Ligand binder design. Structure first.
Ligand SMILES: [Mg+2]
Ligand SMILES: [Mg+2]
Ligand SMILES: [Mg+2]
Ligand SMILES: [Mg+2]
Ligand SMILES: [Mg+2]
Ligand SMILES: [Mg+2]
Ligand SMILES: [Mg+2]
Ligand SMILES: [Mg+2]
Ligand SMILES: [Mg+2]
Ligand SMILES: [Mg+2]
Ligand SMILES: [Mg+2]
Ligand SMILES: [Mg+2]
Ligand SMILES: [Mg+2]
Ligand SMILES: [Mg+2]
Ligand SMILES: [Mg+2]
Ligand SMILES: [Mg+2]
Ligand SMILES: [Mg+2]
Ligand SMILES: [Mg+2]
Ligand SMILES: [Mg+2]
Ligand SMILES: [Mg+2]
Ligand SMILES: [Mg+2]
Ligand SMILES: [Mg+2]
Ligand SMILES: [Mg+2]
Ligand SMILES: [Mg+2]
Ligand SMILES: [Mg+2]
Ligand SMILES: [Mg+2]
Ligand SMILES: [Mg+2]
Ligand SMILES: [Mg+2]
Lengths: 88, 70, 119, 271, 101
RNA sequence: GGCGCGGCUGGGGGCCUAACCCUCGGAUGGGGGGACAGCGCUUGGC
RNA sequence: GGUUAUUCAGAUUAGGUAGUCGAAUGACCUACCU
RNA sequence: UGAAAUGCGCAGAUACCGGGAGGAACGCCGAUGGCGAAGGCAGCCACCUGGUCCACCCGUGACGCUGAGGCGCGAAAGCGUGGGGAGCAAACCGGAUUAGAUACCCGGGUAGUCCACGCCCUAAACGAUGCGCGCUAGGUCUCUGGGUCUCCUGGGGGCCGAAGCUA
């Protein structure tokens, strides 16, 4: 899986304050990991459709958030989209 | 007529080596005996068979033996 | 060729004819017989009566090869299966046992259209 | 897998050509004790002995290591996968630790980099070569010998290979790329795995000229000739073979076997 | 670094001298992939239910071990190279599940 | 008509190596094949 | 005594078809349908 | 096989023992069972990976529901290139049944079935029941999870039935 370790690190590196394990800001970064991870997997497992679905859902979930985050606060969106590095 | 449950003490059914223990689940033919004959739970019966299969692969348990005297 | 007290008797229980071959300890036929060998044809060869006469005519010849004991093994869910065996009693020869080796696929080759019954 | 072509010209609409991706950016062959003059067309009386050869691009012969037991235990690094114009296979210029360099039929999987070595010790890893009494039955192996200490014969064509079916005395069983079944000698060396560039069969010459570059000239149907020339010679309006179809020499080609019964190579085959 | 349970079965009719050899290959092998071995239960010869390579006996060994969860697949390719190895058989490790406590 | 023995064996199986054949950083040798193949005379065929 | 071909005379049918089945003569040795 | 015949068999078959090859499918466990959006998924081993349920009530603060078009998946059959090919098996051949039998039964048999990649995109693709959300008796067994635990609590799978709906 993902290292329960570096998972924390992801949460850590992206969060407004200690604890905070569910900010929009986090969830994004937090999914994005699991995405890119899956992404890279499918890249070799092309024939693994089932899982692909999940990725589509995952990309979806984060699509929503990133929207809500843009919709609510444009400032910190322009940060997260870029720190994370997406929207291409 | 005789549940294989109250037939033996406490053991690890996830173990795939207690040949003596396991044989106690495989009839006089080689068949992985039913639930109706070891009474185990759903959850139990499973991890059981899962190992019993494992076993046969190492060679400890059989796959079938001949049906004896009729 | 040689005579031996210890032997083995194989029963082949088809539906359209049952047959038996009697072999030495190793597994090498000394004699055999079957419903046709008896004198039948097609369906009649399926009769358990023939299955009697067979096992006898088998054992019968077998006896004159010094055969006395004969660990029995049957294969075939056939109709004349146990009568083939029954005949090995009345035969007059000491059956060391009775086994059913009747072979069974652990789910392998698709079978004929007929024997397609599973689903 | 293969390069296609947009149909900007007939013929070119069907013609595919290999992708020499696997060719390690290395046009030049190793000029060293590696190339060599080459020429021919027909036999040593002046006469043609093999119909329809001739013409087609000039070639350099790349010397190949087919005995590969000169350098037992001596390792070497795979310096390059090169294009050989005179085999279906691709080749590997490998540098030995010795400072000795040779070429080998690049098998499938070989990466420029890979260590590799010959000898009985050697690892049963892709690339290394060693006697047969020594490869684990079931292994697919290639570039095999046939009689020992004699150079590789079996399985050198592109993406070809043979498996070991079993051993049996001083000999081992093999299943040739042809499907044949043979007892070869135990002491026969064989590089491990199967041959490079299996993608080969799917090229499509596509035009007439391309066959010509290959040095193969046009080949004319028997039907097309005259009685003087060839047993299918009746010519008389597109016509039926008049008889059981024959070679220009008149031996049946329709299915007749030719293999010399009393060959000694015989009692070592089964296929 | 998950825990595993590398069973192995060796040519029962094989002397302890040659056996020494095979046992070392396994050793270095396990090491070539860094399987810093925990326990072991080398349970000797044993009679088995079905002739394995036409032999009714077979030597057993059981190296519990932690190691990189990736080279695990490859390690087993190695252990199986030996013909006197008659059936490698790794397993992921799990806390027992008591039945009829 | 049957047991034991040697020359003669004829057939069939197996193994050998040294003829003969192939091959090996040139070897009075190593390896592979092997009394086969190849070749001579001869038999009948297509 | 058997085989085959045909035919109408019956027969089986509620009836028809066809068939089976029977007979004659020449040659020869249960199915469908209304 | 209804009984047969074609078929195979003295050139030695069937039955039996040993040895070998190869392909396909996974007996017993197995189920009124589970999982998945659907198609669908079953020996064992690892690896990579998707979804889902429960506990704690810690985090964000309405970020939701649907969804034309789009995009992906999509049983079997079928198609292309290349493999593979045991058993089965449209087409095909033969035997028999029949008035006839291009069928049912029998003997034989090829694509196909299997794999890789690419395409096809249909179905009684069925629960013939769009998805989400809140409302409105209980009884019974069953899978799975939590809790001092002859039972409460959550999530699935069933049968019987309050009211109510219903031709
Ligand atoms: Mg964690
Ligand atoms: Mg008959
Ligand atoms: Mg031409
Ligand atoms: Mg002429
Ligand atoms: Mg002509
Ligand atoms: Mg002309
Ligand atoms: Mg004309
Ligand atoms: Mg002779
Ligand atoms: Mg001799
Ligand atoms: Mg010899
Ligand atoms: Mg020699
Ligand atoms: Mg020799
Ligand atoms: Mg000399
Ligand atoms: Mg020899
Ligand atoms: Mg009438
Ligand atoms: Mg009438
Ligand atoms: Mg008349
Ligand atoms: Mg809060
Ligand atoms: Mg708050
Ligand atoms: Mg608000
Ligand atoms: Mg299909
Ligand atoms: Mg077609
Ligand atoms: Mg077709
Ligand atoms: Mg349904
Ligand atoms: Mg109801
Ligand atoms: Mg009511
Ligand atoms: Mg009511
Ligand atoms: Mg309503």
């Amino acid at each position: 899986p993902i290292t329960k370790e570096e998972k924390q690190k992801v949460i850590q590196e992206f969060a407004r304050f200690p604890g905070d394990t569910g900010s929009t800001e986090v969830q994004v970064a937090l999914l994005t990991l699991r995405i890119n991870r899956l992404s890279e997997h499918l890249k070799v497992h092309k024939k693994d459709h089932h899982s692909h679905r999940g990725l589509l859902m995952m990309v979806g979930q984060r699509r929503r958030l990133l929207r809500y985050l843009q919709r609510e606060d444009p400032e910190r969106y322009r940060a997260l989209i870029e720190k994370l590095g997406i929207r291409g | 007529k005789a549940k294989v449950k109250a037939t033996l003490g406490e053991f690890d059914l996830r173990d795939y080596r207690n040949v003596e223990v396991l044989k106690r689940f495989l009839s006089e033919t080689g068949k992985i005996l039913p639930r109706r004959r070891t009474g185990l739970s759903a959850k139990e019966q499973r991890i059981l068979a899962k190992t019993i299969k494992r076993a046969r692969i190492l060679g400890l348990l059989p796959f079938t033996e001949k049906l004896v005297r009729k | 060729k040689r005579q031996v007290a210890s032997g083995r008797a194989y029963i082949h229980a088809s539906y359209n004819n049952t047959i038996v071959t009697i072999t030495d300890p190793d597994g090498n036929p000394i004699t055999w017989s079957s419903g046709g060998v008896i004198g039948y044809k097609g369906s009649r060869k399926g009769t358990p009566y023939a299955a009697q006469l067979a096992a006898l005519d088998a054992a019968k010849k077998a006896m004159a090869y010094g055969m006395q004991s004969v660990d029995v093994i049957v294969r075939g869910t056939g109709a004349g299966r146990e009568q083939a065996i029954r005949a090995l009693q009345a035969s007059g020869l000491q059956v060391k046992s009775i086994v059913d080796d009747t072979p069974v696929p652990h789910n392998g080759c698709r079978p004929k259209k007929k024997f397609r019954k599973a689903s | 897998a293969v390069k296609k072509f947009k149909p900007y010209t007939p013929s070119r609409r069907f013609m595919t050509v290999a992708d020499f991706s696997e060719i390690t950016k290395t046009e030049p062959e190793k000029s060293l004790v590696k190339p060599l003059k080459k020429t021919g067309g027909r036999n040593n009386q002046g006469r043609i002995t093999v119909r329809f050869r001739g013409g087609g691009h000039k070639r350099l012969y790349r010397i190949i290591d087919f005995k590969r037991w000169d350098k037992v235990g001596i390792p070497a690094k795979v310096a390059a996968i090169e294009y050989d114009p005179n085999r279906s296979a691709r080749i590997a210029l490998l540098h030995y630790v010795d400072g000795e360099k040779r070429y080998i039929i690049a098998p499938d999987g070989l990466q420029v980099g890979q260590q590799v070595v010959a000898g009985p010790d050697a690892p049963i890893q892709v690339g290394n070569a060693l006697p047969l009494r020594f490869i684990p039955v079931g292994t697919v192996v290639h570039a095999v010998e046939l009689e020992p200490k004699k150079g590789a014969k079996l399985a050198r064509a592109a993406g070809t290979s043979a498996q070991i079916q079993g051993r049996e005395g001083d000999y081992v069983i093999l299943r040739l790329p042809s499907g044949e079944l043979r007892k070869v000698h135990g002491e026969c060396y064989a590089t491990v795995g199967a041959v490079g560039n299996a993608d080969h069969k799917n090229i499509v010459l596509g035009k007439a000229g391309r066959s010509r570059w290959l040095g193969r000239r046009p080949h004319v149907r028997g039907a097309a000739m005259n009685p003087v020339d060839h047993p299918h010679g009746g010519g008389e309006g597109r016509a039926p073979r008049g008889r059981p179809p024959a070679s220009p020499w008149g031996w049946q080609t329709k299915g007749l076997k030719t293999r010399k019964r009393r060959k000694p190579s015989s009692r070592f085959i089964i296929a | 670094m998950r825990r595993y349970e590398v069973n192995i079965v060796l040519n029962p009719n094989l002397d302890q001298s040659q056996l020494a050899l095979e046992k070392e290959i396994i050793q270095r092998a396990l090491e070539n992939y860094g399987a810093r071995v925990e326990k072991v239960e080398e349970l000797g010869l044993r009679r088995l239910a079905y002739p394995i390579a036409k032999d009714p006996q077979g030597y057993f060994l059981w190296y519990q071990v932690e190691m990189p969860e990736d080279r695990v697949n490859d390690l087993a390719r190695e252990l199986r190279i030996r013909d006197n190895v008659r059936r490698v058989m790794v397993v992921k490790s799990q806390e027992p599940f008591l039945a009829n406590a």
